[PDB]
Amino acid sequence: SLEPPPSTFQPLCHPLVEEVSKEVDGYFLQHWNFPNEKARKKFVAAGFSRVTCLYFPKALDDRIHFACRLLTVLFLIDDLLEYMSFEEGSAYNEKLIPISRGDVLPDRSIPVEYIIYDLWESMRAHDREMADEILEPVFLFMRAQTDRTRARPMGLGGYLEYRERDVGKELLAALMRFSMGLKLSPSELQRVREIDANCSKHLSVVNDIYSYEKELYILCTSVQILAQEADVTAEAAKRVLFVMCREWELRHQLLVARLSAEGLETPGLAAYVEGLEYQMSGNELWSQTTLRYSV
Amino acid sequence: SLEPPPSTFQPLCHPLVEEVSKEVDGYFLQHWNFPNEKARKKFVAAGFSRVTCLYFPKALDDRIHFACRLLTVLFLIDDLLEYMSFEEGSAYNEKLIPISRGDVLPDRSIPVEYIIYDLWESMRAHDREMADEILEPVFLFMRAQTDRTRARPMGLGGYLEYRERDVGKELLAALMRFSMGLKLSPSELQRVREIDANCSKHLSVVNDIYSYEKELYTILCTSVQILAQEADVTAEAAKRVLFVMCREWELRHQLLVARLSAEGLETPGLAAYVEGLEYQMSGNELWSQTTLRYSV
Amino acid sequence: SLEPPPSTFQPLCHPLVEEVSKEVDGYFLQHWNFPNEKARKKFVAAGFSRVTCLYFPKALDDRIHFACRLLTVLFLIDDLLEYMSFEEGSAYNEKLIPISRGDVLPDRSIPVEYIIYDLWESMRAHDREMADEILEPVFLFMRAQTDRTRARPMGLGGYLEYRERDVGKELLAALMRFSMGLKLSPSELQRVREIDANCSKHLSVVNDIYSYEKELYLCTSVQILAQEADVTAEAAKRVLFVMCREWELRHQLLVARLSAEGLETPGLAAYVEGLEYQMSGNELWSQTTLRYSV
Amino acid sequence: SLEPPPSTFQPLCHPLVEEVSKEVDGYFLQHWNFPNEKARKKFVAAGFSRVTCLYFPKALDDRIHFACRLLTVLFLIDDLLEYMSFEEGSAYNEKLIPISRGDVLPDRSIPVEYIIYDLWESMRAHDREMADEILEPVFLFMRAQTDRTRARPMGLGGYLEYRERDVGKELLAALMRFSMGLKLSPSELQRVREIDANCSKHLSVVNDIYSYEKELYTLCTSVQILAQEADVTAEAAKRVLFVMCREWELRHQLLVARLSAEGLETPGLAAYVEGLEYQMSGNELWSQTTLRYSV
Ligand SMILES: [Cl-]
Ligand SMILES: [Cl-]
């Protein structure tokens, strides 16, 4: 057992977790075309809404279900793209994008299509401004799902610089903003780029730490890279990476304290950086428990 | 102020430290032309022999003074080289290599010359063969504190690899054997490859951690800066991560030592060698944290 | 000598180049106040519109001048920045952004301000949708001129990946679409990311090759390769040039594939060809511009 | 399909190749225990002596056969090591080192053992001091033939710095000196360090270029590294690496010119660096024709 090192952060779950969870889970079991009974209860066991509530514990009470719905359908779609070629998976997603914009009408006979359509319709109806702002982050993520990335020599610095721009973590930060009703200005966002990049690496590395065993069923992970650079075992590497993650949590506290001392911390940004902290503690807890990293 | 993480390595100090320290410091205070008392006291206060006894606590009682003398002159030289050009520097040293070999007699007018000559002649008297074995390592080390640094990009991986072969660490390990009267076969040292690389890396990084602030008086070329940049954190955060890495290399050392005895096996010689390296790693750490050589 | 190796890419030049040059040069010679009659004649000598016409040989006739003016001003601001702190520079640029948006009026007392204002007001007047689409790429680029590089080890592979995402090259390819009046949806844009990344690299490396010398006073493919291979800078440029010819062959292959997989469209076919012209034009320009102290 | 770019170097073979080949071949056919008449044909077919004469065309007439015998037995052992574990192979070679020094007698009933003993005994009988000088280079090479590589992310720069210190190339340069009777002082050798390093990369890269297809039969090669750092195909990388090799040929000539311009190029040094030039052109022709790189 790894034994995480001490941390000043702590996981927190959204207050309405049980309530939203049943609501959203019901919706999908009702509308989604699962293959069989095994898949049906594998889905309930996954508890995507509980995942979402762990990542956005501070979302507004009336918007958390939106987040759960979006993440649930993306998790479902993600798992589906596993069984299809590049050309089909890409074609699959590109078709849902115009529908997501509301520009194209569903084929009410195809679950994923009307689920996606209705979802975005309802989000815009609740807040068009913020709903439109999160469209691109989602599309970016959706396009990356069928992305064929190059295997190339990559040291620790290159790998981390690359994770700093991860679109998955970007989608999470934007979805968090929507869930919290935090309309951040262009200026405010620029002010927390370092904080975002720092957070993005944290989430990524913690995922790497707990997914390595499974990854070692194109292996691109910080555990292998550090193990090879330092000439130690994967486990020793996980230990070193975990301490690096704590260094990043301390960096987060410092970047935030600085922001405030310079008087650049607005109420919106305060909620935001705190939201990120819970995304980090949440992701860690999720990583330690998710069945997706089992084997 | 930087709390080193827990370690199973316990450093030792050679019993005769006070004895040799007096003998060897007395010699140099008598022959080396120290500019003044201020330099005399600093030299003593630096106690180069105490450093030697910390790195080689298992050295044989009658050889430890050799190591102290050798290292003391190399530290005194090393000190002078920073007041010269790479060309002067290389000239100053290259002139001392023939003298170390014995082929060229001292100009008893230049202390360093006859101190180098007399010491080497004395080492052969005791054990000619072994005193000959460390000649290369000694020159390789001198033919390096003058060589130019071939720029080129460098990540953590490449920097660590390059340190696994540090010629300073090799001289230390070679000086250790001569000091412990260890005589390993060409095959024996071949069996501890990974152990020597892992140790040289430990020693280098611990040095990096404690010499960073001073080095940052200027380019750098140190694991501290490299990790700080690659992970995007402060140098202090980097020192703490690198320290944890050092403990991993200590755990790796033990595992490599285990496999060595289990798998096939060691030798009385390799068992002594291998333990010796452990003492270097811990002695090096105590030294790095206390030496003024890293003081700003 | 530095003899460029053979290339199947033939640069093109916009036929209206002379017409637009005197048109645009004259414009700045009237409003842009240079230091002396020499800095002036030096300007007309650089001919930034010729550069534009090499890059966008197929820009629409009634739009090529927009491109010329935008680059002519980015190049002028460029040289201007080289003489002020990373504070004075970022301030300067940051006030040209809202004004570029039309949200803030140009203090008519400062030329660069109203030149920018009128240029953008003018582009929106011609095609408001496509004009707003380049604001971002232009801003990203202007912001980039004012920040100091990162601070981490970088080998050839990382430097080349870093260049596949060059701000300037993205600006050029967005200016090009505006110039050719090419309305490309983000979906079609997706299908050519490899081609764009490939092109971006070609442009940056050819630039590194000819600007190395001037940059004598760094972050460049020329120095990185010279250190990695342990050869002279001149030898590195020669190896880099052969690599560029490989990227040109790659472009051709990517283009054939895009066409083979039923993914090609008339607008993409045009965009893809346009990037080719940029590669060959940029090379011709790089070999002759005085900007690099030929 | 792969056309070498123009070069100012040219391959050359040793005048006595036909004579030495017959002799050295005959010796091994007589003493080496080839399994069956089949392996004997394959052996003569390999022409290890002919390869030696391609790398050492300036060898003295009375010493070229020493080089042929040494390389022949090394090529033979190299192949045998293929059917052993790293540990077994290591023990095998470690046995032959004390015999090479002449410190331990051969077991006259084990061919490799007495063939090794007799070769060195005869080399020391021809030129004692120089023969003893090549001992270390041969042992380094013999030991390197069996240790682990250790996979680690590596860019073009790190891979080339590695090849600069290749023990194989160090063996060829030392053996070339013994074959040409060039006694080089410790100072002369240091003046040629850059040149030696430059030459090493050339031989290795040229070997990489032609051995690549063979290596793809499932790793660590300049072809692989460059294709992915530049993001082009292996074939394109080969074309680019070949031009780089030519740049190293120019650099060799330039380094020699400077060495000469300054006052440090003795006659021994001059014959040495010319010797390296033919090793480079020879290795190229060999790389182009050897069956060791085929199917
Ligand atoms: Cl994941
Ligand atoms: Cl030191």
Curated annotation (Swiss-Prot), chain C:
Catalyzed reactions: (2E,6E)-farnesyl diphosphate = (+)-aristolochene + diphosphate
Pathways involved: Sesquiterpene biosynthesis; aristolochene biosynthesis; aristolochene from farnesyl diphosphate: step 1/1
Known outcome of mutating E215Q: Abolishes catalytic activity
Record field: pH dependence: Optimum pH is 8.0.
Binding positions for Mg(2+) 1 per the UniProt entry: D78
Annotated positions binding Mg(2+) 2: D78
Keyword annotations of the record: Lyase, Magnesium, Metal-binding
Cofactor: Mg(2+)
GO BP: any one term: isoprenoid biosynthetic process
Class of enzymatic activity (EC top level): lyase
Annotated binding of Mg(2+) 3, by residue: N207, S211, E215
Binding site for (2E,6E)-farnesyl diphosphate: R291, Y292
Molecular function terms from GO: aristolochene synthase activity; metal ion binding
Note accompanying the cofactor annotation: Binds 3 Mg(2+) ions per monomer.
A UniProt-annotated Pfam family: Terpene_syn_C_2
Enzyme Commission designation: 4.2.3.9
Function comment: Catalyzes the cyclization of trans,trans-farnesyl diphosphate (FPP) to the bicyclic sesquiterpene aristolochene. Produces germacrene A as an enzyme-bound intermediate that is not released by the enzyme, but is further cyclized to produce aristolochene. Aristolochene is the likely parent compound for a number of sesquiterpenoid toxins produced by filamentous fungi.
Family as reported in the entry's similarity comment: Belongs to the terpene synthase family.
Subunit structure: Homodimer.
Name assigned to this protein: Aristolochene synthase
Taxonomic source organism: Aspergillus terreus
